[PDB]
Design an enzyme around this catalytic site. Structure first.
Site, PDB file in Angstrom:
ATOM      1  N   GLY B 171       2.590  -5.231  51.302  1.00 54.16           N
ATOM      2  CA  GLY B 171       2.682  -3.814  51.033  1.00 54.16           C
ATOM      3  C   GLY B 171       2.274  -3.006  52.244  1.00 54.16           C
ATOM      4  N   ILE B 172       1.284  -2.133  52.065  1.00 50.43           N
ATOM      5  CA  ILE B 172       0.897  -1.151  53.073  1.00 50.43           C
ATOM      6  C   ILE B 172      -0.325  -1.635  53.846  1.00 50.43           C
ATOM      7  CG2 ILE B 172       1.949   0.764  51.826  1.00 50.43           C
ATOM      8  CD1 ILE B 172      -0.834   1.518  50.821  1.00 50.43           C
ATOM      9  N   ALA B 173      -0.499  -2.966  53.894  1.00 50.75           N
ATOM     10  CA  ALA B 173      -1.517  -3.663  54.699  1.00 50.75           C
ATOM     11  C   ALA B 173      -2.934  -3.299  54.269  1.00 50.75           C
ATOM     12  CB  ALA B 173      -1.322  -3.431  56.201  1.00 50.75           C
ATOM     13  N   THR B 174      -3.152  -3.270  52.949  1.00 48.50           N
ATOM     14  CA  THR B 174      -4.470  -2.975  52.392  1.00 48.50           C
ATOM     15  C   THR B 174      -5.497  -4.001  52.852  1.00 48.50           C
ATOM     16  OG1 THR B 174      -3.447  -1.936  50.458  1.00 48.50           O
ATOM     17  CG2 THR B 174      -5.750  -2.613  50.241  1.00 48.50           C
ATOM     18  N   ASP B 215      11.594 -12.683  54.509  1.00 50.39           N
ATOM     19  CA  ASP B 215      11.397 -13.039  53.101  1.00 50.39           C
ATOM     20  C   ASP B 215      10.366 -14.153  52.941  1.00 50.39           C
ATOM     21  OD1 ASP B 215      11.644 -13.462  50.320  1.00 50.39           O
ATOM     22  OD2 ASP B 215      13.660 -14.292  50.449  1.00 50.39           O
ATOM     23  N   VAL B 216       9.547 -14.030  51.883  1.00 46.67           N
ATOM     24  CA  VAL B 216       8.562 -15.052  51.520  1.00 46.67           C
ATOM     25  C   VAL B 216       9.253 -16.369  51.189  1.00 46.67           C
ATOM     26  CG1 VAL B 216       6.742 -15.644  49.912  1.00 46.67           C
ATOM     27  CG2 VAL B 216       6.940 -13.302  50.633  1.00 46.67           C
ATOM     28  N   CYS B 239       3.982  -5.816  39.999  1.00 45.47           N
ATOM     29  CA  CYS B 239       3.639  -5.345  38.663  1.00 45.47           C
ATOM     30  C   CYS B 239       4.467  -4.132  38.254  1.00 45.47           C
ATOM     31  CB  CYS B 239       2.146  -5.023  38.580  1.00 45.47           C
ATOM     32  SG  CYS B 239       1.606  -3.631  39.602  1.00 45.47           S
ATOM     33  N   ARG B 410       1.438   0.949  43.758  1.00 45.94           N
ATOM     34  CA  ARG B 410       1.432  -0.509  43.703  1.00 45.94           C
ATOM     35  C   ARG B 410       0.219  -1.144  44.368  1.00 45.94           C
ATOM     36  NH1 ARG B 410       7.045  -0.140  45.804  1.00 45.94           N
ATOM     37  NH2 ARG B 410       5.893  -0.196  47.780  1.00 45.94           N
ATOM     38  N   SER B 411      -0.525  -0.387  45.159  1.00 42.01           N
ATOM     39  CA  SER B 411      -1.510  -0.941  46.067  1.00 42.01           C
ATOM     40  C   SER B 411      -2.797  -1.342  45.355  1.00 42.01           C
ATOM     41  CB  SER B 411      -1.819   0.080  47.152  1.00 42.01           C
ATOM     42  OG  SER B 411      -2.349   1.260  46.571  1.00 42.01           O
TER      43      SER B 411
END
Ligand SMILES: Nc1ncnc2c1ncn2[C@@H]1O[C@H](CSCC[C@H](N)C(=O)O)[C@@H](O)[C@H]1O
Ligand SMILES: Nc1ncnc2c1ncn2[C@@H]1O[C@H](CSCC[C@H](N)C(=O)O)[C@@H](O)[C@H]1O
Ligand SMILES: [Zn+2]
Ligand SMILES: [Zn+2]
Ligand SMILES: [Zn+2]
Ligand SMILES: [Zn+2]
Ligand SMILES: [Zn+2]
Ligand SMILES: [Zn+2]
Lengths: 347, 431, 86
Positions: B171-174, B215-216, B239, B410-411
């Protein structure tokens, strides 16, 4: 495309409110009242048409989501008239759900109990109110229209019935008790001495009914007199101002007052008469003119039956030697919407 | 057996049966548990239904189902502020009486029985230490019994090295941000992400510090070996579809479930061999509103007992999430520092006052702020402040508000992840 | 201009002229200056306009009309000789 929505919401991550659930249209006039989603303009008109339409046996005439009478699924709650269709249950709930539901035969619908997991179709909260508000804003010339009552909040109905006893009819509609000694209907023959104090002493009433007699005259008092007495005692039985509870009234004519007195009556009850015939083989056996506020009383009207044919019917039925019978079956189905407002019970 | 259920209730109120000997949710006799909130027993099927349904919420913001039976027919929503509970008519027919539901609907300022100022009622009484029992209720999930995670002894402070993180579903590199907030030296941060905007956020906020991948699913074991040994593998399944909040729930573990198994595979690929006693750690995250058999399959595959953590204890949101992992002190209770804002009002901009003290992310309550006698959304910088991000964190690229909000939602909650990653300072080098 | 860009971005232009539409070659792709970079271009503090929930097109439009900050600093600077200081 009814089937396409399952891609549109899932893959395109799109709100259900932006598509029409009732058919698959992408342009929606507004949102659907009972369930989560939009609804397009022809479906809106179709819904408003079908809204309170029931069948003769008791259940709703069309499919409660989309108003399709072609296929019907009867709900298995004795206090729920809501009938559905297959195309919706599989389209909105997932690919193999309507056949499972049909095989259950003890299936409560979404409105009854939503604890069952649902694929896409979500039930709107408060939906009774939302329905009422929808009709208000979306019907052209909206009418006297009361919010539908939750089933546990449904009390027995208090009937006044003038010049005709309706105990037999509404008991057969399960609206009145066969096991009660205290009667839940008050039939009155003669109202001539009746005062506002007297109608108030008799309790509050939910439904008021009054009808002119058939052609065989029990008395010579002119047919206008019954109408006016009805109007008076109707103004007496009105609920005290500020009452949220649903009050109704239904006046019935067996073709016995002429056009002049009919015009007077139309003025005083503040709407035009609804003619409801008995047509057998295409042929006009009988007919009856109504005034009432009861939902979808006006969509039972038959604009095919002309006034000249009713004058001919009146002339032919007066000149017969037969005793006059109350036309029970014509106004019987005109009490069906009160199922959704008042307490039913059958045996 | 519905008549028998009601009959049993009748026998209870005639003092012929105890209310604690019957399951008040569905009337079953197979009483294993006690109902946490209220008085009565609790069978295991109703436990599973309670696990799935208790934290589900409608688009309204109120509960999808009834609080008592997690089901029910037509619910009764609460008028008390910040309360979102629902009581179906059928339960209130028993526990309060068959004439008091109809008379309580007519009561326009109606409070629910978890919010009832009196607290005690005839057939229904509220059990006293219900938040304690709610907390214990997830430690009560011992149906999935496992061995405890292996505790490795701490490496001395002169021998510590910078940490190496494989972060799937970045995501946003949390995660890296939280590691930098703790002051841990990061040797390398490999991140696999697909959404361009989140890539972009990370690239900019982390200048010359992140290597990006594709891609994972495309990532092979050869890639895992050749990108150095990893010291911390973190990830969280999407989620968006898994929750009941999305109106589009065509499946439940199509899409998101696949991506969980991608985390599973690359966790094995990054796990050191038996005999290689070097400190390795991993965290998985998921949302509480999930399936039981889903939760079972996840706990089995990851071979561990989840820990629910709600962010209300530290932040300004209701963010209850499961964390699987072997990080030390994952169980221990959350502490909220003075920098963390426990009231929503503190997270608001100036000139803005909040009616709510906590907002839950999703004529009706759609927007949570009363500014200038007008209902309005939380601003994007405020949503950042609600999760504990640094101020203006996501204002990198020219993106729409709706997309950016969605990105934020989403984070992972930043003080929660700070609470989880904090004992890793004992194992790796500091700045 | 390159000093005003974010990291991971390289500008072909040395100046951007507002009175090759999209001025930035990032990841072999043509892209607009981001809002916080336009703020940097005129000399505003970093993240100056991210106050409310406004769209990107509106916010860019809100930035473009504004006076150039070091120019207005250059102009307003001798007023320190005439009024009080902090
Ligand atoms: N196949 C995939 N590979 C990588 N990331 C993916 C993916 N599918 C979805 N994602 C992204 O993974 C995220 C799921 S949850 C993200 C939460 C993350 N910890 C954070 O704090 O931002 C979403 O941003 C989603 O767009
Ligand atoms: N009648 C009016 N009164 C006040 N402001 C007005 C106006 N009509 C337009 N404006 C606004 O005045 C601005 C014109 S130029 C603004 C430049 C300003 N020095 C700055 O640095 O932002 C625009 O923001 C415009 O929306
Ligand atoms: Zn339609
Ligand atoms: Zn249908
Ligand atoms: Zn039903
Ligand atoms: Zn049970
Ligand atoms: Zn319940
Ligand atoms: Zn409450």
């Amino acid at each position: 495309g009814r089937d396409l929505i399952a891609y549109e919401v899932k893959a395109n991550q799109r709100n259900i409110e932006d598509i029409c659930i009732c058919c698959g249209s992408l342009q929606v006039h507004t949102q659907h009242p009972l369930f989560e989603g939009g609804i397009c303009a022809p479906c809106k008109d179709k819904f408003l048409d079908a809204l309170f339409l029931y069948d003769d046996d008791g259940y709703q005439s069309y499919c409660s989501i989309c108003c399709s009478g072609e296929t019907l699924l009867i709900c298995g709650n004795p206090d729920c008239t809501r009938c559905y269709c297959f195309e919706c249950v599989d389209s909105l709930v997932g690919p193999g759900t309507s056949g499972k539901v049909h095989a259950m035969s003890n299936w409560v619908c979404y409105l009854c109990l939503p604890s069952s997991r649902s694929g896409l179709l979500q039930r709107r909260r408060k939906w009774r109110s939302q329905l009422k508000a929808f009709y208000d804003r979306e019907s052209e010339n909206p009418l006297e229209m009361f919010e539908t009552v939750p089933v546990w909040r449904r009390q027995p109905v208090r009937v006044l019935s003038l010049f005709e006893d309706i105990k037999k009819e509404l008991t057969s509609l399960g609206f009145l008790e066969s096991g009660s000694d205290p009667g839940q209907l008050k039939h009155v023959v003669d109202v001539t001495d009746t005062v506002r104090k007297d109608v108030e002493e008799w309790g509050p009433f939910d439904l008021v009914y009054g009808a002119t007699p058939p052609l065989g005259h029990t008395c010579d008092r002119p047919p206008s007199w019954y109408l006016f007495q009805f109007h008076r005692l109707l103004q007496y039985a009105r609920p005290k101002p500020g009452s949220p509870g649903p009050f109704f009234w239904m006046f019935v004519d067996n073709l016995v007052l002429n056009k002049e007195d009919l015009d007077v009556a139309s003025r005083f009850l503040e709407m035009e008469p609804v003619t409801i015939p008995d047509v057998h083989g295409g042929s006009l056996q009988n007919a009856v003119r109504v005034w009432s506020n009861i939902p979808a009383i006006r969509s039972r009207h038959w604009a095919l039956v002309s006034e000249e044919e009713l004058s001919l019917l009146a002339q032919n039925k007066q000149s017969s030697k037969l005793a006059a019978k109350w036309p029970t079956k014509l106004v019987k189905n005109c009490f069906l919407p009160l199922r959704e407002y008042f307490k039913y019970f059958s045996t | 057996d519905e008549r028998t259920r009601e009959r049993l209730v009748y026998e209870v109120r005639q003092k012929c049966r105890n209310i604690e000997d019957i399951c008040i949710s569905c009337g079953s006799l197979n009483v294993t548990l006690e109902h946490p909130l209220f008085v009565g027993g609790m069978c295991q099927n109703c436990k599973n239904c309670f696990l799935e349904c208790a934290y589900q919420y409608d688009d309204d913001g109120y509960q999808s189902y009834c609080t008592i039976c997690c089901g029910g027919r037509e619910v009764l929503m609460c008028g008390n502020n910040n309360c979102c509970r629902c009581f179906c008519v059928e339960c209130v027919d028993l526990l309060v009486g068959p004439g008091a539901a109809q008379a309580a609907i007519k009561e326009d300022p109606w409070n629910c029985y978890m919010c009832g100022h009196k607290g005690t009622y005839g057939l229904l009484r509220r059990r006293e230490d219900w938040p304690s029992r709610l907390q214990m209720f997830f430690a009560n999930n011992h149906d999935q019994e496992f061995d405890p995670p292996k505790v490795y002894p701490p490496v001395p402070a002169e021998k510590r090295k910078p940490i190496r993180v494989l972060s799937l579903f970045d995501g946003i590199a949390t995660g890296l941000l939280v590691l930098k907030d703790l002051g841990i030296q990061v040797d390398r941060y490999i991140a696999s992400e697909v959404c361009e905007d989140s890539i972009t956020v990370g690239m900019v906020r982390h200048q010359g510090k992140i290597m990006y991948v594709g891609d994972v699913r495309s990532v092979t074991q050869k890639h895992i070996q050749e990108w150095g040994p990893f010291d911390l593998v973190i990830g969280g399944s999407p989620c968006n579809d898994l929750s009941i909040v999305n109106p589009a729930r065509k499946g439940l573990y199509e899409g998101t479930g696949r991506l969980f198994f991608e985390f599973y595979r690359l966790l094995h690929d990054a796990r050191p061999k038996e005999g290689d006693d070097r400190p390795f750690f991993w965290l998985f995250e998921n949302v509480v509103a999930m399936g039981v058999s889903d939760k079972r399959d996840i706990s089995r595959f990851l071979e561990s007992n989840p820990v629910m953590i709600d962010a209300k204890e530290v932040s300004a949101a209701h963010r209850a999430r499961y964390f699987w992992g072997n990080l030390p002190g994952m169980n221990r209770p959350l502490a909220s520092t003075v920098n963390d804002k426990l009231e929503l009002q503190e997270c608001l901009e100036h000139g803005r006052i909040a009616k709510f003290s906590k907002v839950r992310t999703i004529k009706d309550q759609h927007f949570p702020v009363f500014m200038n006698e007008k209902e309005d959304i939380l601003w994007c910088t405020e949503m950042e402040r609600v999760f504990g991000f640094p101020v203006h964190y996501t204002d990198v690229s020219n993106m729409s508000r709706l997309a950016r909000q969605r990105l934020l939602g989403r984070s992972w909650s930043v003080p929660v992840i700070r609470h989880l990653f904090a004992p890793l300072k004992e194992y790796f080098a500091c700045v």
